[PDB]
Design a binder for this molecule. Sequence first.
Ligand code: HEM
Ligand SMILES: *[C@@H]1O[C@H](CO)[C@@H](O[C@@H]2O[C@H](CO)[C@@H](O)[C@H](O)[C@H]2NC(C)=O)[C@H](O)[C@H]1NC(C)=O
Ligand SMILES: *[C@@H]1O[C@H](CO)[C@@H](O)[C@H](O)[C@H]1NC(C)=O
Ligand SMILES: *[C@@H]1O[C@H](CO)[C@@H](O)[C@H](O)[C@H]1NC(C)=O
Ligand SMILES: *[C@@H]1O[C@H](CO)[C@@H](O)[C@H](O)[C@H]1NC(C)=O
Ligand SMILES: [Ca+2]
Length: 595
Amino acid sequence: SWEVGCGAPVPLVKCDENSPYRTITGDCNNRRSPALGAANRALARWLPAEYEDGLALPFGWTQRKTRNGFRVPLAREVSNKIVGYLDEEGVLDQNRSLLFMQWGQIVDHDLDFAPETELGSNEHSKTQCEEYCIQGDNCFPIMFPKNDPKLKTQGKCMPFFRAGFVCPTPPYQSLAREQINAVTSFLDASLVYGSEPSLASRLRNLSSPLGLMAVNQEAWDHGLAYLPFNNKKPSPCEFINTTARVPCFLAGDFRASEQILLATAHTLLLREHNRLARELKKLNPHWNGEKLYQEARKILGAFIQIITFRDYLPIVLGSEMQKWIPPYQGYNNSVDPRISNVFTFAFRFGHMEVPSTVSRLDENYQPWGPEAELPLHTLFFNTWRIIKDGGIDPLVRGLLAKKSKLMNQDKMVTSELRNKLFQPTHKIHGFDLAAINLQRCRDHGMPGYNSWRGFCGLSQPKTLKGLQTVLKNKILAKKLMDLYKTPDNIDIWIGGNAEPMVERGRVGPLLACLLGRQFQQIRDGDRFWWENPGVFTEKQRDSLQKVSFSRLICDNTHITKVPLHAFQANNYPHDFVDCSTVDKLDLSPWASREN
Ligand code: HEM
Ligand SMILES: *[C@@H]1O[C@H](CO)[C@@H](O[C@@H]2O[C@H](CO)[C@@H](O)[C@H](O)[C@H]2NC(C)=O)[C@H](O)[C@H]1NC(C)=O
Ligand SMILES: *[C@@H]1O[C@H](CO)[C@@H](O)[C@H](O)[C@H]1NC(C)=O
Ligand SMILES: *[C@@H]1O[C@H](CO)[C@@H](O)[C@H](O)[C@H]1NC(C)=O
Ligand SMILES: *[C@@H]1O[C@H](CO)[C@@H](O)[C@H](O)[C@H]1NC(C)=O
Ligand SMILES: [Ca+2]
């Protein structure tokens, strides 16, 4: 009646509602509707898609087609006129560590991923955009505006391919196009363990019966483990230094080597699983491999949940934390736990938190080596700088002692991302993440800024002066009106990120509402939430309350000096303490069974 009843994923999945553990795919979390929150299904629509033709074609696709009577601006022009800035001085966050930015990317990768269509590049399909910039089908290139420097140096466009959609692949009709979420919507450490059975098994050490995750066999970090290499060619991590020839890492998530501090974070997370699996073997020598894997996995998922909801979200949402995410009251099976399409743009706020450089620091937290600080763009797809140039310990100290970029209406996105982004199969450090984000909003059929203001119960500015009051910025509002002609047409990514930040937070009201709702739903709609009665024992839960990121670092590096509050801006040695000061995770309550 209402829909075509589309069933894209393998419709066949057996549940076994006895099981104490999550599935890898996210299936069977919800008993009534077992596909809810599972990978490889459509992103949720909180509002109906808005396409130029009602169905599929992004706004901007057809030159003569207006949105509400006006042409949508070129995404790269928006980027150049609004998002870009020259001066990196004065741009850092005096009260957020670089680790704050990094955790955000980690959580994001746990929750959502809308891969571009035709997930493996075949033949010369992509001579369309890359070579000749011809818009057609899934080819939706980002065209340069006149007077853009990149015109002189790089050609007429940046290539951009449309995101994958559910029912068919290249064709579709009789319904609006719905993009795919290829990972589980639950905050479940899927970035570590995988979202498909297949990857999930390849990541494991099945050779031993200790419940370990596979580790690198070709390299070590003062004996501490690295992730296995992904030996798929062609490797971007190889392409960026064919002399080192150090390939990308293989992780539960495809994007783990996009930048060195993300690869770093994934490495910490792997070690913690192996560490937990060893402690569980000691206490329970009678537990088999499978038991040890699941129980470690379960602890690790709880860890990410706690860090996120107890430490991270409060200092993102600030004053609005309590409004959108009140204290836990138990699993509710009527709550939809699926990630919305809009959320996958709202969480891009992190793009304005990425600074232009990364530092390696020694044990006195001083520059590590002559080239301790590096431009961010030299670190995309960069594994060799880990394997061959100090392991993760120096980078982790940088995450603690260096600062995030602060979002700034006059300095939104560093040119390292806005001009120097590298993407696989594109060969150059010359893309623009901002422009991509805006093109993707259109690709995904996003409602515009005032639709979402309306959704969130917020005023909907119609005039320049209305917009000035909401943004509390006259020039920004003017540039936005010059480009969009109406606030109704402002892309959600830029509109949302334009708004001044809420007290004690790092996003504005609109984003706090959109993020706040999504996270509430992730928690309340999850049958395996760590605090749901039955998931963990009383005593297990008492031990998990004492997890911290500080302690993750101590147990999984050879770092012995850490802050107590790692997401804060911390200066060494004053704000730093010895590792012995810090609570450990007490695994006693996982002792087989009591006397
Ligand atoms: C150097 C750091 C980072 C790089 C290089 C980076 C790069 C990227 C790229 C290339 C995409 C895909 C763009 C597209 O095709 O539409 C992306 C998407 C995204 N990024 Fe970032 N990003 C970074 C940091 C962050 C941070 C700090 C956050 C959040 C706090 C974040 C959240 C997201 C999200 C949610 C997506 C959409 C994922 C999806 O559902 O497909 N990123 N990022
Ligand atoms: C590619 O990686 C190599 C190392 O794998 C980098 O060079 C090493 O780095 C410096 C170069 O001055 C020295 O320690 C060694 O002489 C280099 N080793 C080798 C094998 O040459 C090199 O700079 C990297 N290139 C890029 C562009 O990243
Ligand atoms: C810095 O951030 C934390 C939030 O976690 C807050 O408790 C602390 O008071 C802040 N410092 C400032 C800006 O006063
Ligand atoms: C798996 O387990 C054994 C014992 O710890 C170890 O020696 C072996 O190298 C591991 N295999 C991989 C690839 O992680
Ligand atoms: C559960 O969640 C929905 C929100 O989607 C709410 O309307 C409903 O009252 C809740 N019911 C329970 C069981 O608390
Ligand atoms: Ca997940």
